[PDB]
Structure formats: C-alpha cells, structure tokens
Amino acid sequence: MSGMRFDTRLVHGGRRPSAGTGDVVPPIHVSTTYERRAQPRYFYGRGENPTREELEECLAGLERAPFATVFSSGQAAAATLLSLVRPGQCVVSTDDVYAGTDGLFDLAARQGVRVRYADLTTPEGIAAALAEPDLALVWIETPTNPLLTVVDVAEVSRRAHERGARVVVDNTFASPVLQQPLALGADVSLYSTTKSIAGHADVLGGALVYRDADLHAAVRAYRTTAGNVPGALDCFLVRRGLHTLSLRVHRQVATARVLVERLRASPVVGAVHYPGLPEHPQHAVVKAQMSAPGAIVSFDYLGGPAERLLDRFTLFTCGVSLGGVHSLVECPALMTHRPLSAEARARRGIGESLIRLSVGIEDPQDLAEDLSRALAG
Amino acid sequence: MSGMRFDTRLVHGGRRPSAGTGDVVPPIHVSTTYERRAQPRYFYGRGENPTREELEECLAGLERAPFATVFSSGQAAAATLLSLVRPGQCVVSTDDVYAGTDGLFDLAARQGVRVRYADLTTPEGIAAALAEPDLALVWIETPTNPLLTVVDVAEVSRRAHERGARVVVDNTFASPVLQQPLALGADVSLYSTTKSIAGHADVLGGALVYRDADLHAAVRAYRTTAGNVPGALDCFLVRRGLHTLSLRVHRQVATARVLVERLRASPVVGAVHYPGLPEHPQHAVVKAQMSAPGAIVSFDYLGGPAERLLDRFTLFTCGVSLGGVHSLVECPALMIGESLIRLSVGIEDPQDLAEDLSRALA
Amino acid sequence: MSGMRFDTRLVHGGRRPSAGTGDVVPPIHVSTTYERRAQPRYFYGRGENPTREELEECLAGLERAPFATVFSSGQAAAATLLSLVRPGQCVVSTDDVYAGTDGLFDLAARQGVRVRYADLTTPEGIAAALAEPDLALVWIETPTNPLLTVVDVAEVSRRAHERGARVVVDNTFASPVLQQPLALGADVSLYSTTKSIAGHADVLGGALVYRDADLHAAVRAYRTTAGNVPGALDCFLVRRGLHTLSLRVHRQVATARVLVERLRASPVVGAVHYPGLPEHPQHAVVKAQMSAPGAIVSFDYLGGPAERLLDRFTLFTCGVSLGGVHSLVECPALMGESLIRLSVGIEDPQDLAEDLSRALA
Amino acid sequence: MSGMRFDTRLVHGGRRPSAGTGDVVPPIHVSTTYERRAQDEPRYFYGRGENPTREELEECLAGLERAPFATVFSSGQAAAATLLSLVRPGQCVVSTDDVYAGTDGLFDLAARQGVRVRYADLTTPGIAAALAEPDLALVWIETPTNPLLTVVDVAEVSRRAHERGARVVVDNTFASPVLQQPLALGADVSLYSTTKSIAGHADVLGGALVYRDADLHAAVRAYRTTAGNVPGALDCFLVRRGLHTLSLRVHRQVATARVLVERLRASPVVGAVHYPGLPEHPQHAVVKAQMSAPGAIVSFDYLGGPAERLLDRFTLFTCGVSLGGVHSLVECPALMTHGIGESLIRLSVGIEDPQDLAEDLSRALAGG
Secondary structure (H helix, E strand, O other): OOOOOHHHHHHHOOOOOOOOOOEOOOOEOOOOEEOHHHOOOOOEOOOOOHHHHHHHHHHHHHOOOOEEEEEOOHHHHHHHHHOOOOOOOEEEEEOOOOHHHHHHHHHHHOOOOEEEEEOOOOHHHHHHHOOOOOEEEEEEEOOOOOOOOOOOHHHHHHHHHHOOOEEEEEOOOOHHHHOOHHHHOOOEEEEEOOOOOOOOOOOOOEEEEEOOHHHHHHHHHHHHHHOOOOOHHHHHHHHHHHOOHHHHHHHHHHHHHHHHHHHHHOOOEEEEEOOOOOOOOOHHHHHHHOOOOOOEEEEEEOOOOHHHHHHHOOOOEEOOOOOOOOOEEEOOOOOOOOOOOHHHHHHHOOOOOEEEEEOOOOOHHHHHHHHHHHHOO | OOOOOHHHHHHHOOOOOOOOOOEOOOOEOOOOEEOHHHOOOOOEOOOOOHHHHHHHHHHHHHOOOOEEEEEOOHHHHHHHHHOOOOOOOEEEEEOOOOHHHHHHHHHHHOOOOEEEEEOOOOHHHHHHHOOOOOEEEEEEEOOOOOOOOOOOHHHHHHHHHHOOOEEEEEOOOOHHHHOOHHHHOOOEEEEEOOOOOOOOOOOOOEEEEEOOHHHHHHHHHHHHHHOOOOOHHHHHHHHHHHOOHHHHHHHHHHHHHHHHHHHHOOOOEEEEEOOOOOOOOOHHHHHHHOOOOOOEEEEEEOOOOHHHHHOOOOOOEEOOOOOOOOOEEEOOOOOOOOOEEEEEOOOOOHHHHHHHHHHHHO | OOOOOHHHHHHHOOOOOOOOOOEOOOOEOOOOEEOHHHOOOOOEOOOOOHHHHHHHHHHHHHOOOOEEEEEOOHHHHHHHHHOOOOOOOEEEEEOOOOHHHHHHHHHHHOOOOEEEEEOOOOHHHHHHHOOOOOEEEEEEEOOOOOOOOOOOHHHHHHHHHHOOOEEEEEOOOOHHHHOOHHHHOOOEEEEEOOOOOOOOOOOOOEEEEEOOHHHHHHHHHHHHHHOOOOOHHHHHHHHHHHOOHHHHHHHHHHHHHHHHHHHHOOOOEEEEEOOOOOOOOOHHHHHHHOOOOOOEEEEEEOOOOHHHHHOOOOOOEEOOOOOOOOOEEEOOOOOOOOEEEEEOOOOOHHHHHHHHHHHHO | OOOOOHHHHHHHOOOOOOOOOOEOOOOEOOOOEEOHHHOOOOOOOEOOOOOHHHHHHHHHHHHHOOOOEEEEEOOHHHHHHHHHOOOOOOOEEEEEOOOOHHHHHHHHHHHOOOOEEEEEOOOOOOHHHHOOOOOEEEEEEEOOOOOOOOOOOHHHHHHHHHHOOOEEEEEOOOOHHHHOOOOOOOOOEEEEEOOOOOOOOOOOOOEEEEEOOHHHHHHHHHHHHHHOOOOOHHHHHHHHHHHOOHHHHHHHHHHHHHHHHHHHHOOOOEEEEEOOOOOOOOOHHHHHHHOOOOOOEEEEEEOOOOHHHHHOOOOOOEEOOOOOOOOOEEEOOOOOOOOOOOOEEEEEOOOOOHHHHHHHHHHHHHOO
16 A cells, blocks of 8 residues: 555555455454464464454554554553553543543552643643653543643653653544544554444444554553454454545534534534634644544533433434444533532533534534524524 | 435434434344234344335435335346336337346346337437337436446436336436436336445345335335345445445545546547536436436547556456445456446545556556 | 265365465455456356355255255245246146245246146145146145145156156255255255254345256356345355254254144144154155154144234244244244144253143143 | 243343344344433443343353353453452462463463462362462362363362352353353352353354352443453354354264264374263362263373374364364364473364264374
8 A cells, every 4th residue: 555545545455355256345254263284374363363454454554554453442452552551650641531541540550550640731731741750651632522622742742752651642533534643753543443433333443553563562462361352343344434434534524613603603502612713722733733623512501401402402312422424412511421520520621511512424404403403592 | 304415314314213222323133033922013034124124214215205125136126126017018228238137138028028229318219219019117227337328317207107107217327316316207216235325345235216105015025025135234234335325426426527537638548438528428418417427437448458458457446346435447348349448436545546547548 | 075974064064265364264255346357256246255155065065966056035046946937837836835935936827837736745646736738847845834744755756757847845844954855856955044054043045956057057047137146144144053053953853842742742732733743644754755853843722712822922932934043933824723833943842841831721 | 031941041041022123033233322312211321331232142141150140251361351350469369270371371461460370289188278378369260171171179169269258260161051050169250261162153252251249240340341341242143143052062062072082092092081071080070070061172192193293184173273163173282272291182072973073083093
C-alpha cells in the first residue's frame, strides 16, 4: 500500500489476495489450530490468526505505522498498555477521562501504580504534571467526553518526551480520519474499534497502533498471556465496517455542524459544546490537530427535566456508546456519569441538564427535525 | 418510517424493536423452527424469518413500496418473476440483457414462453416490440451492460400497460439511490443485492420490490415452494451493507466522473460510454430518470488486445461483478468489441484510481 | 478419504489443507468475486465457492459417490431434480410424500408434467404404477411422512430402470447414517440438510448426491441459472453440524426405541408407527435396507383433541421440522385428526420418556 | 432446568424463549448498544457489560454443574487471568507443578505483582507441606495433569485448603463437566478453556469460570467489565452450539482412547503408557472416586527413534497443539508445548472411527 492514500488503504490495507483461488475478500480464518507439517508461523489461534493479522495491517496502515495489535475490546487495549507500567511508576492523565479508563486506573493504583490527574490545557498544568518522578506514561484523551475540551498532543508529547515518558492518545472520539496522534508526536494511538471504526454497533473490539518494536514485543506477549484476543468473526466485522470509515465520518461531521447551528438557535438551549465553534476555548489547537471537528455535540438543556427530553426523541436512540450509523442521545448525569456523586459532577462541569449527541448517518433534516421536536422550544 | 428521507430509511427501515432487551441492531434469527404455543405468524424458516422480513421492509421502504421479497441470488429473483409467465405468453426484453437473464430466457422458451429481443431506445423499436400477441412481461435493463445505453422506463411502461403487460426494471446497475423504477411507472424493480446494495463483495442475494398484492402472493408462493430463500446470516450481511449505500454510491459516481475525464484525454482510448456524457445518445432520458449517472464506465481500448491493458492494473482488480467497495475491471468479450473495457468504480481514493488507470493505459 | 470409514469421513471429508497457514478447519470463503490474474477455476461466487465445494465433497464421500450438489434448501434440491422432467413426461411418487414435495409436484403439473401417486409397497402397486408411459422419474420417500411406511428401494429401482426411468430417494428421514440409497440401486439421494445433517435447527439447506456425470452437468447448470445456491456461512454451519451426525443419529434412535415402548404401553394410544417394530407391515424391508429404524415416531392419540396433548409437553417443543438436537412434536393434521408425530432429539431419554408419559396421562 | 438430567441441560440450558416469534434456537444478539426506554426492567446498557447470547451460554454452563454462577471470557487464559487477579500482594498461590504453560505464564506475571507462587506435589499427604504456606489465598489444581496424566484428589485437597481459608480452583478443561464435577467434589471454582472440548470443533476461542460464591461473582464480573476480556456474541453462539453434543462427543472419545491404549500396550516401540483408566495407574483409586470415565487424552513413551520422524508419519491424526476437538491430534510436548522424556507423545482423541485411528497409530509406530 505504499503511495496509496487513506481512502484506498481503508479498502485494500491488509487485503491478502488468496493464492490459488484468488478471493478478493480474504476468507475468514476460524480455525483455532494448525497443522505443523503443512507450513512455520501458525501454531495456535490465541497467538496467531491471519484474519486478525489482516485487520492489524489495515489499522497500522491508516497511520503509516509499522505495528498494530487488536483486542477483545477497547478496555482490553487500554488494560494491555497500562500493564506495562510498573508499581512505583507514574501515569499522568486528565480528570475527565473515559469512565472505563478511570476504572483501569483504579485497578493499576491497587497494584501500586501512581496515577496523577492534571490540567493538560495550560502550560502550568502541563509543567506541574510532568514534574512527577518516575513518569512512565502520559495518557491523553482528546477531545474529552462530554465537554469536548482538547489537549495539544504535539506540545504535551514534546514536554513528555523530555521526561522520557511514553505518550498515548485515546483517539476513539476523532478516529484516524480526523486525527493522527502518531504524526502529532504521540507514541501510541488507542482505540475502541467498537465505536466509529467498526461503525455499525454490532461488534466489540480494541486496537493499539504504534511504532516501537520493544513495545510491540511487550504488547504481544501480554495479549497472548492475558488472552484478551478478539474472535476471527469479530475481526471480520470490524474490518468490513472499516471500508466505509471515511465516508461515514465525513457525513457525521457535516450533519453535526448542522445540528450545532440548530442548537445555537434554540431558546431552550444554553451552552453548546463543539470543537468546531470559533469561540471554543482551544480553537487554535483544534484547527492545528483535527482535520474536522468531529461528530459529537453536547449542550445544556433549559426546557425542563432531562428524562422528559430523552423520552421525546423518536429518531435518535437513547443509549450509551457513540460513533455508529444510528444517531444516539444520552444525559451523562443520568447515564454515563450516573455512578458519580452530584458534587463530583458539579466539580467536573457536568450539569444535570447536560445532553450529549452522537451523530449517525441518517438524513440531516430528519435528525434536525427530531431534535427540534424533542427540544420543544 | 413515514416522513423519513432516503438516508434515514437506509439506517432505520425494518429496524424492529427488541422487546425486553432493547437491542438497537436487531438480533440475527437463525432458528429454522418456532414454538407454536409461544406465540401466530412464525412456523418454519423457509416460509417466515424475522431477519429476512426486516431486510425486505427496508428495501420496500427505499422505493416507498408496499412489498419486497428477497432471494438466495439475483438470478433467483429473476427466475421467480419469470416463472409467472405462462406457456403461450410472450416476454419482450432489451437486447443486451445480463447473460444470466438470457439463460433464464432460454429455460422459459423450453417451457413454451415466447421470448422476443428488441431495441427499446426508439419509438419504432418499442412500437414494433410491444405489438407481440399475448405480451405478458416487458423486461427492461437500464442502463444496459456493457454499452450503458438507456431505456425510457416511463414511456415503455405507458405503452406496455396499454397492452396489459407487466413491466420489470433490472435496477441493479443504478441502485435505488439513483433510479426509482416504480416511481417511473414500472411494476417491479429487480435487484442482484450481491452488487452495490450489499456492497462489500461478501454475500449473494436478490430482491424484488413491487406494489401489487396479487403479485406478492404469487412471488411468496413460488419462493416457499421452490425454496430459493436466502440464509439469515446472509440477510444480516446484506442489511448491514445497506446502511452505507447512499454514501458509497455518491462516492463511486464522483470518482467515475473523474475517471471519464481521464479516459477522454488518453490517446489509446476510443469511444467512451457513460450515461453522464452530454453526447450520450440517450442523455435526455438519463437526465429525466437518473439522479446521477452511475459508477459504471466502459470504453474502447485502442492499444491492442484487452489482455495488454488488463495485465497492467495494480489497484483495479480484474474480475467480474460490480458495485462493490473494491474497483473492478473486465473485458466483457473475454470474461461489443474485443477491446471494449468495463470499469466498476469502488470507493478508493479517486486520485489513486486515476493514476492506476493512466499507468495501465500508458 | 479412500479406505476411511463413515465416521472418519464425517470429520475429514472435504477437509482441504490450507497452504501456508495450515488451518485444520478450512477458512470460510465469503468472497463473491475472484481476481483472474491470481490463478483458473474461480470466477464468481454463484458459480464457484471453495467452502461450498468442501461440503459437497464431504456429502458425496458419505455415500462413496462421485458427485454432490448443495442448495439453498431441501425444496430447492427437489425443484432442481424436478426441472429435468419435460412436459408430457411422467413422475411416479409414493402417496405419502412431504407436503413441500406435493407443492412442487403441483408446480410441475402446471407446466405439463404428469404426476401419478402410487402404492409402492406392494408388487401390484409397483407394477401398475410403473406402467405409466413416458416414465421419467420415480420419487421414493422412505420411510414416509408421517405414517413411516417403507418402500423397497432395490426392488423399485430394478423395475424402474427396466422402464428407463431415473430413481430418487428422499433420504432426509433416515440420513446416510441409516440408509444408503445409491448402494440400494437408486440414482439420486435427496436431502433437506436443514434436518438431521446440519442437526442444530439453525440453518436451511439441501443436497443431491448421485453418480451420473450427465446428470451432474444438468444439475449444476440449473443451479447456476436458477440461482438457488446456499451462502458460504450457511455451508459452514451445515458442515460443522455434519461432524456429529452419526453420534447424534445413534442417540436419537436409541431414545426413539424407548419412547416407542412407552407409547405401546399407554391406554390412550392407538396405532403406533415405527419402522423398528416387528409388526411393522414392511419390517423385512426395513431390516434389509436400514441399519437402524430411525428417530421419527408417529401414533394415534385417543385421549382427546391433539391440542390438549400438545399443550402438556414441557420438554418436547411443539413445532414443525425434525432431525435436530431439540426433540419436537407436531400434529400433522393441524400443523387422521389424532395422529401425532415425534422427532427425537438428543436429550436424556429418561427426561423425554417422563415428559411423554406426563403428557399422555 | 430443575430436575432435568445432564444431557437435557446441554440442549436446553439457557435456552431463553423469544417473546412473539417463538424461536427454538435463540437469535444471536450482536448489538453493542441498547435503547434505554425500551426496557420494562432495565438490564441491558452496553455490550461489554451485558449481552443475552453471552448470558444464555453462561446459564447453560452453570447448569451443567448445578451452580448458581458462570462467567465466560475471550479465552481460557483470560478466565485464568481474571481469577488470578483476585490474589493480592503478600498472598500465596499453591499450584500443581506440571501446570499448563499459559497458567505458568500467568503465574510469572502475578509474581511480579507481589504474589508468592509455590509449586507442589499434591498427589501425596506433599499436600500438608504445600498448604503450610502463610497467607495462602488460592490452591490451583489441574487434574488430570498434562502430559503425564497424574491425578489430584480434589475433595482431599479442598478439605485441607479450606481449613486454611484458601480458595480452591480446578482447571477442568481436560476432563470436561461430563467426566468430572469439581464443585461437587468440594472445590470453589471450575475453570475451562471452552476452546477445547466444550466448543469442540476447533473453530472458536473461549474460557469460563463456574462457581457458587456471590462475592466472587461480583468481583469476577467487575474485572471482566473493566479489563474487557469479553467474548463476542458470534463466538458465544459457536461455543453454545458445540456444547449441545458435548456428552456424545466425550463418550465416543473415551471409548476410542481405551482402544488406542490397548493398541499402545501391544507395541514393541512403546514404553510407558499413561492413561487414568489403567488399573496400575498410581492414583487409580482417586480416578475411580472422582472421574466418571478416564478421559480422551493418552500419552506414551516412544522408543522407535526420533519423535519428529514419528509425527511425520500420521495421515489421520493431525500434528498440532490444542486438544478436545472432533479432529484427533498428536504432539510431542518436548518439541511443541514444552518426567517428560524427549520421546513422550501425547494423543488427543477425536470422534473419527476407532479402527481408522488405531490403524493410523499402528502404521506410524511401525514405520515403512
């Protein structure tokens, strides 16, 4: 795939043509076991599988990276990377990370990993955070959920590498269509492929994309031992969804922009959060590192109880997750951030009436009409 | 899905709620049999299946039609419709029809059906064609393969209905994104969903979309008896591909236009066939019945035997079929001049495809 | 697979090695299209598919036959075979065929095929039946549904071939574990693989198994033109179920014998139909052509409306189809008026016997 | 499934009715996301946490051991990793010396987290010494062992371990719940690679834990959700589908293994033959007390020359690792997976015809 552009690699990356039969779509390798005398690289499915390898080759290609490793889930990918941090070492992350990531951070702390939360949006926040001794890993999620703030990956990576730390970007929100963490200076891109990469809300998966060969050996050794491998049929569905990733993301972004303007015009809407708004507090950073501002929107609803707003949607689905072809709506205080106390949410800037939209690929006018009907301004 | 626009119907058409569990993507119904005391519409998988029905509901909705029936393949859909023509009756069709369709025509002829091929692009061709006695079915493929000629569906349908005949359009090439045969006056839209509807070259399927309730009973009776039904996992894959149909088709068309301009400037290219060219012999009809001119292109290669060109592609795949995410190239005569080449445009980067095409031609 | 016994062929028949990777289970070929320059037998999925071919090789091997062809369903396999009969020619069939088969016979008749139903259990029935002019096909279902009548395949085949007719046996009920129609002299074995061959009630399929090369060309030409091909994922599920076919059938038969003993001892049961009973009117034929008497049983219920009996089962499932791991019960007249049919699954025989007894009570 | 016998539970365990349509085989729930307003009782939020197809498989597995809980995983390793994650810094795990290589791999990781791992001989009243360890949290029993097929008395070790307050897990992958019931024997957890005989068709990876403790249940589910080592729905469907025929396959495999053992005992190029069913097996009394049949794994010392040459001669047995599937497998632990001689050979007996398998084995042993 040398010289081929992004949209071509989506279709042909890892597409091994089939010797003898010539299948355009590679066959699905379900076998757990391999005949030793018929080859000698394939021994057992937990360690080796061609369908899985083809997906990894495709993902790596999307970032022009030498390596990728896929997992049973996004959580499993994060767990694997975090497992490389030793007791006594430090991970610096931000406060507002994905609840699952925080869940993993809690597990790591109980094994003696130091987790330090920080403000990575200011020079003083960054300097303070990276002053931590034995700093092993800087964990960046950008844009963040659900307030959609962004962290300057290139700048944090520069400062972090001065301290000898590894930098990972959870790039699930943006996808490699919109953001290229390795090109920005990060060491690892982390994905829940469950979201926009597979894109059809019908399979779980995770991925790490990176360039370091020692990291590659460590990641592969842990996956084989921990056994957090995806099934071949799952890899097939992720790979199949991947073909249309740039098509889907481009449509989702265009519709999100339309919905943001509807929200700004509604009398029952307060603050509107979107990386693309000119008045976004980190607009220069968004423009510098995202080719488009994404398909997630959040806003403060002023018109009455959030539960009633959620009940009025007839096209948007009320549920968690994001990135899929079906548009979704949730209220973080009632759903994704319900386990937190009201005081914890207040401290994080997550109001009771904050609403989050994940824009799918439905007709933008249908989505706009459903939103207006629900808002009932 | 009333009031919902096309792209919304692609995502939510037939997206039946799961009571209790609340699944957004409906679960895949693989069971061949059903407990009778637990219900009473479902008896046996060949007759009834919820996953298959959801796909049919989606397809019917894309044409705002009351009925759709899916099949194990496009050929099976065609066979089913053709089975309704009785011995002694006549089918009139476009001359360049799909070889499989012609294969079916040969079978029908051996059953006492009269098959007549005709030029349906002229008023004289149509009048001559539709003068056949016992005319039961007019079989229109438009645009045609591989010269991409176009037939006026509304006009042929008007004349055919005066003779009481049924009109089917094989709408595989254009897809319902670009052409709406029922809205143009046809009685049936026929699809190989194997091509652009499923779109990922990993499943076979067919479909009929139509409005007549008597036709519906006959089509379903034949499918149940002949058993040319698709599997549930196949319906799942077709339905999954359908979500992105308008995304894929719009991209394929945009890139086809880019390739056509590259072809027109190549000195080893002669005639270029594409419904979107201003000088296309039926361009007025294209503008009237297609919302965009499609993703299939054909052209005369002047540089020698087609094999010389075909061996040089490094991104296009040399193989048959069309409509998929992977770009395909073939020589119809090998796989209509000896050096006529047909392109099926996929969703790769247009500049990569244009470079591969230019490299092969040079 | 030469020299390998039946149970081995179930596991390794058509199990083509994967060059390079060495997969023990062959990978699933979903691709509809093939690169021409990368080979040249594979052009398009409706015509050619390695996963489908592997299943066909396995099925042919189970009857030591050169050819097999699989289809989207048992009905499609039957329809394909029926398409070879010309208007004006005659098909002779057993009177007790599958309802779907009767549906196909009606379709064929509306195209000018003559269908004659006959008693193929007596010498006079056979002689009368096979006297039809232009006899093209003799259609044997044995044991029959739902009365479990049995037809002597070797004898009918002998007489039919004298008349130049082709003989097909619908071998769905028995499966190739219990009955081998080609070895008995028939020309074609027909299967709904939907039933015991796939065995898990989760995929539709059909198959024809035969030896004639001209028939092969005709069958494949029709399948390609009619497009009644199965998908690769479906072929995968059928092939996967096939591994355990003899294990499942042996268990089902053993349990069926226990249930038959229960039925015969019930005061609310009249006639009991089962090929293995000494008093079955064709028991000598059963002993000569079936290695075991099958897993299907039917009987007359005398205790009241069939619906009342059906409602009382708590383990048997009330539904159509047969051959699967789940035991099924149906009333043919609703789905004599009081005839009940059992399809025995692989549950514990004592659990199934208790359920049947509670229901009859 | 109350009152139903084992073979019935294989077919109907977890076979949840489909409201409205009445599907006999439950539909495959592939959706990762769930509509919140569509649930009378809100149980499904997100696929990593909840999935009906996965739950039906778990319900079936739990039912096979008459246990209240089961949890399935992306692999056997992931099931083991989950259980091992619950051992805290400062605590001790005691294990059978000859454990599965992957289990040893996990033990190495745990040791780097401040867990003390002690290997022991649990076949002799070895047990007392082993269980004298301070802070003993977990006793890890694999029985029969691989590849020498020695057996550990589960009830006895469980008795001694519980006096010390330790948890007892049995890796029951080799025997399967058809032949051995660790929870009925006194253990706290049954651990499976369902990749092997439970799925049985060598076409899906999976793992499982089966247990009774509700506090354990909460911890195991919390870890699986956070670590994300969950299986896909299509994989659960394939494991569940394979499970239907589990007792049929195992009974056949055992019968054929007994035939092969007799063939092996008659060979001039075979030394020691290892099989739990042999009368002279050193733990024969324990085998009879805790296994309903002696299993489908056989190993033996090959005396005829280099093992690599022997492996090349099989034409029906497949040379490869893993076990329990419908296809018979052969390996040489010293050359492949690993008192294990250079010429020790292990057979995993499949469901092929016993006479075909015996002839292939005899042909390979004879050479020529």
